[model samples]
Target: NLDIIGKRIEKIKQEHETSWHYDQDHPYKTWAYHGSYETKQTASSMVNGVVRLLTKPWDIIPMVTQMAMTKEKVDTRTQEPKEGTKKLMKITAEWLWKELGKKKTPRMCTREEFTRKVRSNAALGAIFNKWKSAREAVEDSGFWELVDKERNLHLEGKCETCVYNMMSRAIWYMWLGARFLEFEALGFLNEDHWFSRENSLSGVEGEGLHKLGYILRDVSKKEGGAMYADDTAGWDTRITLEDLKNEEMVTNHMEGEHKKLAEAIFKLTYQNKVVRVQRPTTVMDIISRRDQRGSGQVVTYGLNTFTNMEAQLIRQMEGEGVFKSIQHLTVTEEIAVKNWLVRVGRERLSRMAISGDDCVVKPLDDRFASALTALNDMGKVRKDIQQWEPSRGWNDWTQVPFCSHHFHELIMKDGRVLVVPCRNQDELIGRARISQGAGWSLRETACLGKSYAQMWSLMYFHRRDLRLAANAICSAVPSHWVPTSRTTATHEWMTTEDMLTVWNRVWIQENPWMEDKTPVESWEEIPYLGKREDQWCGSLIGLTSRATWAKNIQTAINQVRSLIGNEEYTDYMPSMKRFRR
Candidate 1:
């Protein structure tokens, strides 16, 4: 019974069309559609058409008519059907009406709900009938007994699994059989077939079931092109025999059968000349012998020898005639060589230092020259250095030096010293002691150590590098000591004053008026003097002094008063202050 059911399913699948068409005009349609009310209406109409064709009107009319009448009344009163009894009656009526409508008025229903109801009922009946009839037929035919026997064999391990397993195996074999048939139908057996590339030896063998037996009996015994009486009876006389023999030979070369047929064909066609057929060996024969040792040696050797002869002739022609080898060069290599030439040429030019027509050879600044030369010499001593240090000393100096101190010494050929004033004589003395302890020269300790003339030259010519170096070194110290938010305004002002002194010295050569180059001659010159002093006061005092108290203002006033040596001006005060008599 199960086997019958499975077979029926398989049959249905085999018979199923790639697409099913449901005619809107036909009384019977099987497809369903669901969505909006209008769409449902159209779908119902089509389903009615299908149901009408499958069932009689008497079977569907009563329930369908009742549904229609109830729907009209319910929709008018409540705009919807009531639940329980009312809903049930309406549903039953709708289903019956749809069924009958399919047979009588498929076009009239024209609604999705009606169509669905009709088609669904019809499908249930159709499938149930199919199932019942198939079950009965198989039971009466003694098929179940056979199935039970097969099941017992499986239980005893005589056969694999039970009837189910056998059916499954049959399904697999059926699929394989189908593939074989496809190969034949698609002409995959022919070597020249369009799809022959996809065909394989195993595929041909698997498909050879019908052909193999025919070849063994017919073609194996017969000589090629011989009459039926000459070999076996009905061999040449029957077209079926010829076809079968051809098919089998094409399928696989069974030892006894294939060789016999091949020999017979060759004998009749070639040696005996019994048949005036083309004597060329088929591609199948060649493929069969492909794996044989030395099978194609003669052809391979002939091809290789011909190729060698052709090459030799070409070479000989080139040697005798007007031909020359042109060495090939890549574009990259050419560009690389050209770049190298340009670089080497540029270096030669840089070394020459040819400036103008005078050609007055001035020696390179020995210090700068030495730095560059050291880098170049190091590169020569170590190839790795050449690659690693291509730019050498030419790289930006700021990246390497924290402070300009060493750079200043490098720039200054004639040594000169600077001395900055301390906050007090005691502080100056303490700095002097520290400088001496650190091996600094006496000349660098205090402003009093150098004459004004010597100090001016040092400040004018070398102050920039010195100041830059000092700032760099000072910057490297932990930033906590710097005048950040934690420092008082007074401390920050003092640091700013020291920094401004250095800045003024560095920039004085370009702007000499920044500092007092000469003494004031009149009272008007006092204001200018005061302005210069104020500019030197530095960032902290310069910024907050206007918004804060007069601590720095009093200091500035005292310094100016001492410079001017005027008691009356020294005692000056704003309206907010009083000078006691």
Candidate 2:
């Protein structure tokens, strides 16, 4: 069918040379890539004719009636069956259900009777005969059995709902069964742009005549700005024959292995009349070298999987010497700084927990006007009355000073070094000093810097300093953030009175000890205090409801405890478990 259609097209082409002319300079190129207007209509007409000749809607009547109800003809006068209409009956939903409910004896038509009915139809009879002949051919040769076995084997281990069956059917229909009809349709449509001649003749015994390949041009650049650019400008990026002859000059200014590499690179471009050098800059191009050429910031993610191969090679080559050298250069300062930061942060954290004061554990500067005044007044009051003590807080509990001497040995390749006091001894000492009444006084600790002037002063003051410090910590550490509602509302600093109100609401919400509760009305919306930080940068300020702030404080405390240690530094700095409970 495909060959006949193609031959007919060739005959038409012979009649008129202008009908299917090939033109490389033209955009359409050939009839195969883009058809003449008449071709599409003719192809559609051919398709319609074939469909009408082969298939009719009424052909389905016989196949359907075989499963459902029988068809019968009744005489007009006697009202008795005169002829068979069983093969032409129509099935409906309601009739099917009623028939199923009745559960009558099976009365399927005989194979001969069904065949006779099928053969009665004109086009359907021909299609049925052809299909029957093909089926018989495969069955007689035992090919059908092999195909079924192979299909079942392939389907093994596949899910019942897998699409492989439909995919296999489609492949068989397109390639094994209906390939001739497909090619015929393609031939009529003249759509050889992607459908190659070689593919059409793949099953044929001998090679067919090869058509000239179509070389597509870059017309995109010319369609836009290039069309209006200087008329005399040559758009060719290609180097001329003269340039190709002198391509060896690429390595003339080079030397050593570089020149050799350049010469090796030039060998590939030697044959072409033109030579084009394209230096495309990608991320790989910049970072493919040994060192950090793009950014100093190391990509900490995926390190366990996509490790630095170069670093691995270097480590393997140098052995443990590299690590020892690194330790020698950095360990002294690194350990010192780590010890100091941990000591400071631990003391502040414990103090904050015990006193419920953010200012006590703040990372940032805490010298605001109100805080300074409070400290000054507290100092004066302490001096005036030596016996004065805060009604609340841990002043009554005697602080315990630790004397543990835990040590760690750094067994480097160069030397075996022993380090003493491998714990928060400094922080414990400071905590004990603060526990005593003399720790926070201005006279006793003149170099306190940001420390409270008195124990009561440390016990008091809820300020934004803690909020700022927490926000900074959250930014620095790539930890999961506390969930809070997003808002554009400006955050006003929470005063001592405002914090007290928040705490009162929090206490009620947290501790519902009564069976019945009285409703206390407050502001509906909480203020947007801190921005939530995560992998993606924070865009909007996050709301800090009394409940959220209360939970967030504990969350931050837990993370800090995890980063440092649990109960390891609790000799002097005790865990204030009652803060939350």
Candidate 3:
């Protein structure tokens, strides 16, 4: 009825448009306005029309009858005649105006009150019940679970006196763990090598032999085509290194000191396979003319260390008769070499010292062999440690909490045994001590150690070469090349001696007792900075499960293999669960 009246009011106002038009002087503008009412909307129209009807009280009776139309309804339940809707609307408007006339200014029933009392009272009651229980379940099962337990353990140690080198500590272990698996995957130590240049068998050439062979072939080809002789000038092209070696002393001096010196060196180191050149101009011409190194030409090193490594690698490859023919390097082999170089470049950049601290002792699985077995016990114990109903709220870091699976026993180099959790943040957060009744600190020291239990457990299972050496620069340097202080000086790269220095300093400062092989005690809060984000924060990649870490290593191996055009990798890393189909 109200909707019909509103529509009719709009039609009446439109037909008699000038009278209902908005004006500053019009009384409808002031009287018809309500705080929540929208201008030109149904409620506003109804209010204004009703107010105008009441302005001159005599107008309403005529207006109501004029607007009214006979409309009827039959009650579905009773099949009985009911009052006409239009007639009732007109009657109600008149009745409302009469009631309004009695009061000077009467309050209209509000939309909010109507909705609460008549429209949505029972519907809201059900929603409140659902919301109330949800809050209770979250607080009881989820919120309290996190609030009641220790998420991290912070120990008291003077930051200045602390033994651990906190920077890149996680990556040191990560690289160690990765190298341990790389040996198994590659069947050799890729320790400081971009690619292994050593031969595998009694008969076969090395893995990267063909790559170097291709490079040498390219160099020889470039040297051959580099010089173009002008036939227009009748200069003799028959001059050889042998011709200079046999010439008289006076003639050698007249020929030029540069040519004579090159001839003398050539005669002293004479080999059957030699090329002769009339004039050597380019760097490649040095090969044909056997000329010495310093010319006016600019010499710029490309990936310096990489260049040296490849130079030695190619020299070794040439001895195997791998560089006899340029065409021996197949088209497919060329493509494979390009991909291998890219992967090797990635390996060199990643494994290089600028990324992280060098490992002190060569990381061995045997150091933590028994500890790894104990970790299996820890995993089993965690299965039933404190199972509870899972509910989401403040408790959830992920949809499921990863906290339950994070506990790991960290065995430091100094032989101090500490069980810690692996997380991106708050490895050490709250204040307590290494042992009970020990001292506490206001500032929580950042934890540098990481969990290798996951890495070790899987790598340990498929053990081959139980110990792997650290990826040192000395190892990367060629067999013929001797490293000096000058070689180690540039780039501030960490060296074997520097690594040992760091290790010994840590050992001396820590003074960790070898006899005391007890697990370190956990920390407690004392109205302190115990929250996850409250303490010192830095993002490191989260450690994965043994299976996941193994899979990661496997995937990396497969990537290299794929790039080199090897068949699809079939040897899958053992799943964490040994029971498999």
| Most accurate candidate by lDDT | 1
Q: Candidate 2, residues 1-581: lDDT per residue as tens digits? A: 22212332343345444554333332211112212212211001111111111112212434322222210110001111111111001111122223222322212123233234224321111111123632242224343344334234222311111000011001101111212111211111122111121221101101110001000011111111110000101101111222222323323444553444334223321221110111122000000011110100011111110111111111121221222232132455334333433343222222111100001111122111112111211111112222223212111111111112112222222232211112232222122222222223321222121121111111111112222222222222222212111110011111222322533343234323323233334321112112231101221123334234434444544454454333321111111222314
lDDT of model 1 at position 420: 19
Every candidate's lDDT: 0.21, 0.21, 0.21
Estimated TM-score for each candidate: 0.14, 0.12, 0.14
lDDT of 3 by residue, 263-305 (tens): 3222322211111111111111001122111110001010112
| Model 2, TM vs. native | 0.12
Instruction: Evaluate model 1: give its TM-score.
Output: 0.14
Residue 14 error, candidate 1, Å: 99
Give the poorly placed runs of model 2, Cα more than 4 Å off: 1-345, 348-581
- Which ten-residue region of model 1 has the weakest summed lDDT? 283-292
Q: Which digits, one per residue and each the tens of the lDDT, describe model 1 over residues 139-257? A: 34344354444334323323211110001001111111111111222122121221110121101122121122222222223222111110111111111211122222221222343
Pairs clashing within candidate 3: none
